[PDB]
Each structure stands twice: as C-alpha cells, then as structure tokens.
Amino acid sequence: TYKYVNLREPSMDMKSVTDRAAQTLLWTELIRGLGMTLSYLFREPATINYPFEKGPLSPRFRGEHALRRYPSGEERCIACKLCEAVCPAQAITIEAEPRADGSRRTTRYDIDMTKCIYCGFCQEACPVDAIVEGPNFEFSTETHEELLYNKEKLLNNGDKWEAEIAANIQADYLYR
Amino acid sequence: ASATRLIQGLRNWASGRDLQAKLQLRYQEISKRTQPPPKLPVGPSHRLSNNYYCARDGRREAMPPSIVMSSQSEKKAVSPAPPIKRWELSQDEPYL
Amino acid sequence: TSVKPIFSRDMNEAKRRVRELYRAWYREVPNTVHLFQLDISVKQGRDKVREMFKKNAHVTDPRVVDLLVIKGKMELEETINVWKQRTHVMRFFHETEAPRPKDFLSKFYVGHDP
Amino acid sequence: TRPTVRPRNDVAHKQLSAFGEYVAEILPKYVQQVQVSCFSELEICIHPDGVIPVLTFLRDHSNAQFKSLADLTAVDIPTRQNRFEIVYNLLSLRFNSRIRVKTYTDELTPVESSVSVYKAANWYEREIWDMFGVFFANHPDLRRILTDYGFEGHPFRKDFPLSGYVELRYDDEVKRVVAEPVELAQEFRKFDLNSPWEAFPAYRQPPE
Amino acid sequence: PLTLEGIKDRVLYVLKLYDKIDPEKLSVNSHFMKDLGLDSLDQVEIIMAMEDEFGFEIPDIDAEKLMCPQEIVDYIADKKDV
Amino acid sequence: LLKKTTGLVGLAVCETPHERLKILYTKILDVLGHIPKNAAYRKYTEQITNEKLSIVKAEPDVKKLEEQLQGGQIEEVILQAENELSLARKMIQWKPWEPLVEEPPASQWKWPI
Ligand code: SF4
Ligand code: SF4
C-alpha cells in the first residue's frame, strides 16, 4: 500500500556504467526531450478559432442573469426574496409592493454583477424559475455601473435569451 | 487524426510512443451533446409507511460532549488508539 | 485583582519602556523622512510622534501600556525596515480627509452625528 | 436510523475517553475539563500556565506522540471574561489519533508561546496576535502577518465590524493610496435568521 | 570634557537651541518641569540633544534624575574626568 | 543484518539498537525514580518502560523487536525513548502531579453560551 519513488541503486557493472557515461557524454536524455518536443511540433494544435469557434458548454452553465416569464408574458417573480436571502454575496436587492391589479410583484430587482459570485444559488432557491442564470458570458462592459443591473436590464436579458434559457432548463430540470 | 502516415510515423518515432491509439484531441468517441431525459432514483425515505421522521432524525441524536473529567488500582497505561499498523509495500509496483 | 504581568510589574517600569520607545521613534524620524522621501519636515513628524504618545497619556494600567509599547515597537520595526511604504507612513497625516465640524452648530448644519 | 444518520464510533469514543482519563490524571496541575464529543473527538481543557507542560507531554510521551501541530486557533467569545479561547489541534501519527487542547485568556493576560514545543506554531500564534490581539510571551518574531501595515485593531474579534473602520482608494492630489473612513454605497444588510423555536432539546440550557 | 565652564556653557547652548524654553528664564538652576513648564517628553528630547552634543549614551535611570541644567552638567562631569 | 536506510530522512541507522535501548530505558527509570510514587506519570512511565525493556531484553533479533515493540523502525523507537527521557527531566522541573493551580471561571467551558 506504498511504493518507493527514487529508491533505485544503479548497477555498477561495466555495461551499466558505460551506459550512464554515454548518457552523460552523448546527451541521450536531452535528445529524448528534443524528440518529445518535436513530436508535439507535428501534432494538430488544440487551438479553437475564437470568436468564430466557441468552447464547449453544458446546459448547466452559469453566465449572465435573467428574469423569466410564463408563456403568457406574465413575469414569474412573485417578490418572495428567497434569492436575496440565499445570495452569498448579497448582490441581489429587492423591493416590492402590490401592483395595480393587486399582484405580488417587485418594483426593485437589482443584481450587482460585480458582487455576484455566479454560483447559481438564486436559480436553485427560486420556487417559480423566475431568476435563472443564462448562458451569456460575453457581456464585458467598459464602465463599472453598466454591470449594476436593475429589473429592466434583467427582464431584457430574459426576453433576449428566453429561446435558449427555456431549452437549457428543459434539458436540465429533471436533475433539479 | 488527419495527419498523413508519414507525419504520423515521424511523430510516433520522435515521441517513442504510439500516439494515435491515445489522441488528446477528442472526436466522435465522446458522448452526444443531446442526451435522453433521465429518471432519477429517490432516496430511502421516500416511503408511505414506517417512515416517521423521529426514527431517522440525524440532527437530534447529536448529544452534548460527555464530560470525562471535570474540576466541577494498578490500572494499565493507555494510548489514544492502538498503534498504527505498519504499511505493507505495494504488490502492484513497489519500485523494487 | 492578582493578574499576570506582561513586562512591567508596575507603572515605573512601564514609563521606562514608554520613554525608551519614544527615544527610538525620535531617533528614527529623520531617517523615515529621508528614505521614504516624505513631503513633511522632521519637526512635523516629531510633532506627530508626540501627538501619538500624548493620545495614550491617560492609561494607568501597566499591562495596557506594556501592550502599547509592544505595538509601538511593531510600528517602529515596520518603519525602520522598509515594510511600510510611503502611504502607510503618511496615513498618520490625515491629509485627504476633510476637516470635520467641531462645534455644535456646524455639526447641526451638516447632519445628525453628535 | 440506518441510511441517513451518521454511525456512532463507540470503540474510538471509549478509547479517547480512557486516554482523556490518562491525560487528566498524569497532569492534574493544569487539566480542568476533559470531554469527548458524540462524534469522537477528545478535548483537554487546561489552565493557561500549563501550555508548555501539557503540549510537551503530548508531544514527547510514549503513549501520546502528538508530534504534529495541525492547527492553532483563537476563538473570541465576548460573554466570557476570559474571552479568547486558544485551541490546539494535535495529530498523533504513531497512534493515528487527534486531540484538542483548549485554554483561555483575556485581552491583557499573555499566553506562553509554544514554539519551543512546535515550530509550526510560529506563524499560527502570530496570526492569533494579528487577528485577536492575544499576546504570546517569549515569541521569536511576534508581529502582524495578514493585515495591512498600518492596521489598527484586531479583525476577528466579534466587536470589530465586518467592513472595518477605514477603506482605501487612490487619491490623485497626493499621488498616493490613502486611508479614509469607511462608507458603503450599499450597507451590509443584516439578516435575523434565527428561528424562535428550539431546535435541539438535548442542548437546552437550564433556566435560572 | 576639558573645562567645566565650557561644558556648562555648551549645555546652556543646547538648551537655548531648544525652542520651547524661554532663554530669559533659562538659568543653571531652572527646573524643567515645575519652573520652565515642560512635558516629560520635552525633557526626554532635551536629554537626547545632550547625547547628540556630548556623544555618550545617557541611560534611562540617570536621565530621569536630570531636572535642571546643573544636574546635567554634574552628570556629564561625573561620567568624565574634569 | 545492517539495515541500509531507515527510510526517514535524517534518521541515521543505529548499529547496536539493543544496547542503546537498554541504556535509554534504564536511564529513563533512573530519572523517573526522582518523582514521587503517587505521581501517575511515574507509575505509567515505569509501567511502559519496564514493558519495553522486557521486550528489548527478551528478543535478540531486530526485525521481530520492531514487530513487537510496535513502534515503527527501531531507530525511531530509540528516538522516542530519548524523547521520553527528555520529557521526564522536564516533568521533574514542572511538577505537574501537584493539585490544580486554579479553578476556571464559572462559565468558562460552557458551550453554547
Ligand atoms: S449567482 Fe449567487 S452571487 Fe450571483 S446573484 Fe445568484 S445567488 Fe447571488
Ligand atoms: S426567489 Fe424568484 S420569485 Fe422569489 S424574489 Fe427571487 S426571483 Fe423573485
């Protein structure tokens, strides 16, 4: 249940001593290393052609956040504040009131994406699949406050990415 | 995979290993990106009877630490456990 | 009320350690102004040392001033050896901070703090 | 209670209880409590004058051989008058066991440094100084190890706030990173999460 | 170290280089604490100025007992031949 | 048989482990006689030292001495005998068989608070 790395006493007969002296004087392991580097010279490189090729992702991927809707246009978030209760960065800020038809909806739904640790606890805490974390990772900004998302940005991300978000949830909801 | 047999033989010679049997680039041998839907199993507490929670309550069988000595014969000297058994050398590959 | 001491048995040994620490800082201040190339004068840094020592001038417990001498030696050791940068040395001189309102009336004007 | 309950290790519980009796009767000058947890961990609670005898005994005794200092830790408990709880996690490689040695101090009483017993302790108790303010007497190089060089206070004390008292920014006027009093654009929202109902009746403290 | 009057004049020269002490009230028997009105740290840096002038390290037990310029010149004499 | 290495780095191979262990065990007992008889450290360490000394005297082999001293290599058994001797010389100075120096405060080891 254990093995000894580097507990080999070398053979001291003239054959092995001449082997090690030929290794010293004729640089045999150095030519071995040159041969291994030369072997990688003639391989096809592992380089993908970004942006025209994309790295492989799964339907579980945790990228940009989005607020979703039912298949009626009604937004799924019913202001229950589980996602900011579980948010380990406290990146989520929610206010709420009954809207004009008496429905429990949010007035504020902020996610500071620069506090956010992208761990998907909000999408697993959400009882109505409202907040999800979409597949978008190509959303670098040029200013810090463009990453301080309010509810309108998250609803636009939901409307923007729903055709993909719904298919990824369709692929992964039986594991959840 | 698309390497010609001359470059493939040169590459196998300079590495010293057969490199086509173990390629580090992935091809059609990997799993399909579209999978059938699973049917996941449930745990052993998914029962309709003999399943009272107080008979499987893990958090409530934790007890406070038993105070052995407190400040409020020819008994054998003890160790914290028996001494650790000496490890046996590997039968698989000892490097001996 | 029988406590284990740190270094000083009573306040006279404690003031001896305060006094030696002050001597060490007073010797060090020209070197600190030179090699950190501070924009202060040596008299100004020495006034800051005297201000930091007069800040703790109310303490009557030997263990507390033993710890004050220990932390002052740690500050000195971080300043002699160049472990602090120029910014850490100039953080004693609150230069970018606005002057706080002192009397009742200006504190009333700006806000709710007492 | 088979599939979901952690199975109790009765053999190790009995062995660690017997070894706790052993340590308590070899060193009754310092040992105050000995307790074995339900998940079979042995704590020795000692008086702080016996940091060097108890740790040197556990390091050098033929039935201990706790040659490895795993971890050294303070815990701040502000309701106790000796608020700092200095925890020694020792590892025996000979007997394949672990022991916890615990002692106490307040802000002003020093604990004797244990670098003469374990050279591992050199940075650990220096971290305890940096984070809690527990001075370790007769330490080789006791100073800060983790906080910034001009840092005031000890951050892992529980009366120290989460964001501290000062914050940094670059200031272009003085060409220098400066320290200014801390102001949050969003305050850390404190959540009172504790349930008003008792969870563990076995841990119920008796009333006054 | 050569003459005692030169040592006392040089002690008074160090004390008149020190800015907080009034040179009018600065005499040989002028007490630092209760006459000149000095903090203890003022006396500590006075002793350090004396060490800078006369080139020998005055310890702590015998610098606390230096409360007038005459005590300073008596201590500098007693640590020398003169 | 001349063990070539102990495997532990810095642990030199002892040429005569039996005589070294006999000297160390009798020296532990000589030092340990200076402790009072009611001290449990004296009784426990005399007990395990007499057991180890009986095992050392009763086995001429070194490998079987390793398997029944049950303490790893024989050179680290020698090292632990040295550590026990140094510990006993420190325990004479500490006198830890004395009564408890101080009771703790009343809720010092009470968890949770
Ligand atoms: S992914 Fe995590 S850190 Fe980000 S908003 Fe959701 S819960 Fe908060
Ligand atoms: S957990 Fe879901 S429904 Fe609840 S407040 Fe958050 S996004 Fe809205």
Coordinates of C-alpha atoms and ligand atoms in Angstrom, one line a residue, chain A residues 67 76-83 94 109 126-128 130-131, ligand 2:
Chain A
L67 CA -35.7 37.3 -15.1
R76 CA -42.6 34.8 -12.8
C77 CA -41.1 36.7 -9.9
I78 CA -43.5 37.0 -7.1
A79 CA -41.2 39.0 -4.8
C80 CA -40.6 36.3 -2.3
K81 CA -36.9 37.4 -1.6
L82 CA -35.5 33.9 -1.3
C83 CA -32.9 34.7 -3.8
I94 CA -35.4 43.5 -3.9
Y109 CA -34.9 43.8 -8.5
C126 CA -36.3 30.4 -6.8
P127 CA -39.5 28.5 -6.4
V128 CA -41.0 29.6 -9.7
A130 CA -38.0 33.3 -12.2
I131 CA -34.4 34.2 -11.7
Ligands
SF4_2 S1 -36.5 33.8 -5.5 FE1 -37.5 34.0 -7.5 S2 -39.7 34.6 -7.1 FE2 -38.5 34.9 -5.2 S3 -37.9 37.1 -5.1 FE3 -36.2 35.9 -6.1 S4 -36.5 35.9 -8.4 FE4 -38.5 36.6 -7.3

